[PDB]
Design a protein around this ligand. Structure first.
Ligand SMILES: NC(=O)C1=CN([C@@H]2O[C@H](COP(=O)([O-])OP(=O)([O-])OC[C@H]3O[C@@H](n4cnc5c(N)ncnc54)[C@H]([O-])[C@@H]3[O-])[C@@H](O)[C@H]2O)C=C[C@@H]1n1cc2c(=S)n([C@H](C(=O)N3CCCCCC3)c3ccccc3)cnc2n1
Ligand SMILES: NC(=O)C1=CN([C@@H]2O[C@H](COP(=O)([O-])OP(=O)([O-])OC[C@H]3O[C@@H](n4cnc5c(N)ncnc54)[C@H]([O-])[C@@H]3[O-])[C@@H](O)[C@H]2O)C=C[C@@H]1n1cc2c(=S)n([C@H](C(=O)N3CCCCCC3)c3ccccc3)cnc2n1
Ligand SMILES: NC(=O)C1=CN([C@@H]2O[C@H](COP(=O)([O-])OP(=O)([O-])OC[C@H]3O[C@@H](n4cnc5c(N)ncnc54)[C@H]([O-])[C@@H]3[O-])[C@@H](O)[C@H]2O)C=C[C@@H]1n1cc2c(=S)n([C@H](C(=O)N3CCCCCC3)c3ccccc3)cnc2n1
Ligand SMILES: NC(=O)c1ccc[n+]([C@@H]2O[C@H](COP(=O)([O-])OP(=O)(O)OC[C@H]3O[C@@H](n4cnc5c(N)ncnc54)[C@H](O)[C@@H]3O)[C@@H](O)[C@H]2O)c1
Lengths: 255, 255, 255, 255
């Protein structure tokens, strides 16, 4: 049971991170919403109750994550679980001949920084915090869960930067599990397909709906609560480690 | 919730299948233990109560599986879930030059027959049973879960036939999910690493210690109840489909 | 160079196997076309010249493959390369509610037997033949190259049996390579996407053209000589072992 | 044949990149060695003759890459092939309880920037130069070949940053292929295992020999010429696209 656990959730003010916070808190765990100052994390934490607090932070900054982790320790005593949900998307072709347009370097760099470097920043710092926990009866001190994407495996036209960042997450999952194995911290990754969150609000309704119609079964966007459910499953199951799990209705993305 | 669901579980007399039955019955589901007549399936079904019965069957035989499925309908009225745990193992090198010895054809055929064909036989016949169910609120008529193995991905020396059979289960996981998507039957696969079923627990203690010593974290054989927990998670999560999940404590098998 | 090498090519009377034989014989190697009696191997062996012969054989049969290998030794002195191209296709849904149709067991079995068991039968027997070769300066005694398919990874609707058989080939690639590594026999697998061979002729022209239109680049079916080129590249490169190579114009198959 | 093609080879002053240049120039191609100013690339270009020149540049830099590509256009008129070999390595645990030590953020950022962003930097700019070529008979305008690592798949203890960078390479291979498919530019990636290059010089001789000893077959480090051979095979085969190829003697890395 997740009752009593302390979880730090990046991107916790919105979409999949928020849904995760809701479910876990609803089960008696405590949540720390690590999100940008501009988000509505403060209001979300206020709605989720006394077992939920907001820690304003940018995941690409060492100092910010240190501050939020210190806050989490200070309020809830320890960190049992970390969920990397902070992330951003861009659509931009590598090169467009007809338009004579080139993907910009900084668009590639900014996506890499938040999604990949930002996730690793939280991982390396939170691992030091989980290192201080006494191992439970099973030898465990903590659980770390990251968010990749099926774009790591079937990136679509326009998805080079996103794919690189999420492929980086997939690739570093096993080595980081190996690193932390002697101190009993599990490391797992979820690769969502298409989910109904504000991430997708930026696209034409005909665009979303089309995408939606491609999921083999069930034929719809995933529900953020379904992501949350898989997070809990992973937290609960002591033998799940070093793996990436597709959560995507069996879709395979076309160009 | 799996309360009230009806599950047909092959290899239900022992190890992973048995663990799955115990947990699902313990959670309010009904279970049919599908296994060979000479096994202890009857006793395990008796032990598990009125919501559990034993159906003798060889999964390589169409008639037997038809017989078992007819028994399940007659006893519990419908089938909501199928879990393929029935399997065998062999250790035999492709060729041994020092011994002058060749893997026998029928050793290869037998393992294929039980592990791969047998699983497909249950899937195709149980899909036809599930197609008679009225779709639930989610439009779902059924969930089928197969058992592969990490040997699908890192088959060891001696494991050519087993690896072949488990790779086949992995390979057909998506197309079967695609096939049955229009009727709302999700198809998922679990790839166990090293688990404490009679297959391993009946080995010499030094060997058990050695095998456990290979799992990065936690450094022990998997508990069959952990497989069962994962079966339940997949049953409960409506968006898991067409995927293979490694359940293995982050091990990667060496030759 | 492949110059002077002896290759036994199963499925050599047609399509990819035939083109492999054409290229290799063209590159100074000798080829044995291993294929069924009713195939046109005899005529194809005559067309290719003195350095190519036909060995009639069914790859699911121990004695036949034994007879064909003995033919190959007696005629060309040794065996240095084996390429498994013998294979069959079927299109059949696991279950079709609207049509009231269930995949037959014997369609699943026949596909397994020829494609998967047949390939392992050739592998296990030819390995013992290569093990009698004295290793070259690089320690190598033989190269074995198998044919899987992208259906091992993206099985389409109707391809469950095919995908099972090819996923099998993929899964046993590494263990067999591990098995034979002490005696210097490399094991590699090619996964072709879509190629213009007599295999696809049964299909309606419209489907063939539609499939062709979906290969991203180059936008066409693969030419069998392109497969042949990859086989030579694998033969020639000493460090390629235990791997599966997609040859498919970047396509990813949809349902 | 590669005779007459113009290839831009990053990391061309050393190891795999150098060996690639050696082989292609030897086969009649022209090469531009793109490498750092303090590398001995000039000396290597001078040694390779009229058909090889050096372009001093840091792949993390837009201006430097623009300069080296313009240098290429001016010396050989066009660019037909790009090979990304530029790369660095670091060994550093995510978190080390024993030493109470944490992976630095900048160690992670540096490896990403050189290995992953730098590779994307070259690809996006060179795609612009190949776009200018009239398509050949097969509609092809160019070939892009990247260097990942088996660390993308089995990152070792200490390899998190490196694994992240090469996993990124693997991830973006398909989307970039799909991006450039309508203009006829193929994108391919090689994942080398262990190769005898200066990359490995800074390791203790013991680690090196132990690493070499775990290659199943052939049991040695890979020869840089063997990388070069594979590059050539990919350039030559028109139907290889959107794929990653392991070149590693069938090794699988342990923690
Ligand atoms: N939803 C999905 O379907 C999927 C999500 N994910 C990931 O899940 C995590 C949570 O995201 P979220 O909750 O959905 O978004 P959110 O914005 O509501 O919340 C994120 C939070 O992070 C917080 N945050 C942010 N930065 C920081 C920071 N620095 N520090 C701390 N906190 C930070 C932020 O404030 C916010 O609260 C992130 O890692 C996502 O990348 C992966 C696969 C799926 N997934 C589907 C995706 C699609 S369809 N695209 C398309 C696409 O690729 N197209 C081209 C090809 C064809 C498809 C159509 C377009 C797209 C969509 C919109 C815009 C551009 C591009 C992209 N990525 C996708 N991911
Ligand atoms: N061509 C391709 O695109 C592909 C081929 N391959 C494989 O390559 C090998 C050689 O095949 P071939 O040379 O193309 O055929 P061939 O008939 O010319 O040569 C075979 C030889 O083997 C010999 N032989 C045979 N048996 C033996 C034996 N016992 N012993 C000894 N020798 C034997 C036989 O006599 C003959 O000489 C085989 O192992 C194939 O499986 C894999 C990927 C591709 N590949 C593409 C494929 C497609 S599109 N399908 C579709 C499909 O799946 N559909 C569903 C999804 C939507 C798309 C439309 C249909 C299909 C096609 C035809 C009928 C049903 C279904 C199937 N398989 C495919 N494989
Ligand atoms: N060799 C191999 O086995 C492998 C190589 N590769 C890649 O192949 C490409 C060519 O590299 P190279 O020719 O081998 O090196 P090089 O130095 O001779 O040439 C690189 C050139 O790029 C140039 N260059 C550079 N930067 C730039 C730039 N900015 N702009 C422009 N040009 C640049 C540079 O000047 C130089 O000329 C690079 O992209 C490599 O990353 C992948 C898998 C293999 N591969 C094996 C690897 C191993 S065993 N490690 C271990 C490890 O991970 N350990 C932990 C786990 C346990 C095992 C023991 C240690 C390691 C080794 C050394 C130091 C630290 C760590 C790392 N990476 C590996 N990659
Ligand atoms: N335990 C591990 O280390 C491990 C690792 C990977 C995969 N697996 C797989 O997990 C699944 C369950 O294994 P287990 O550990 O529970 O093994 P087990 O031997 O404890 O149980 C196997 C069950 O399958 C039954 N069975 C065998 N042939 C049958 C047939 N022809 N028809 C019907 N029933 C048949 C056996 O009688 C037995 O009850 C198998 O597919 C196995 O290959 C196990």
């Amino acid at each position: 049971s997740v009752k009593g656990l302390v979880a730090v959730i990046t991107g916790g003010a919105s979409g999949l991170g928020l849904a995760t916070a809701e479910r876990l808190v609803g089960q008696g765990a405590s949540a720390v919403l690590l999100d940008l100052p501009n988000s509505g994390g403060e209001a979300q934490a206020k709605k989720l109750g006394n077992n939920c607090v907001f820690a304003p932070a940018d995941v690409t900054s060492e100092k910010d994550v240190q501050t939020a982790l210190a806050l989490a320790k200070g309020k809830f005593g320890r960190v049992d679980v970390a969920v990397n949900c902070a992330g951003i998307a861009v659509a931009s072709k590598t090169y467009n001949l007809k338009k004579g347009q080139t993907h910009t370097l900084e668009d590639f760099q900014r996506v890499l920084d938040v999604n990949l470097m930002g996730t690793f920043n939280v991982i390396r710092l939170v691992a030091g915090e989980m290192g201080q926990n006494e191992p439970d009866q099973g030898g465990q001190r903590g659980v770390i869960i990251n968010t990749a994407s099926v774009a790591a495996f079937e990136g679509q036209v326009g998805q080079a930067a996103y794919s690189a960042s999420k492929g980086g997450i997939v690739g570093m999952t096993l080595p980081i599990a190996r690193d932390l194995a002697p101190i009993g911290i599990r490391v797992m990754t979820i690769a969502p397909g298409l989910f109904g969150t504000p991430l997708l609000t930026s696209l034409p309704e005909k665009v979303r709906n089309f995408l939606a119609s491609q999921v083999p079964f069930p034929s719809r966007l995933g529900d953020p609560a379904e992501y949350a459910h898989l997070v809990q499953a992973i937290i609960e199951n002591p033998f799940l480690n070093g793996e990436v799990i597709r959560l995507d209705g069996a879709i395979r993305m076309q160009p």
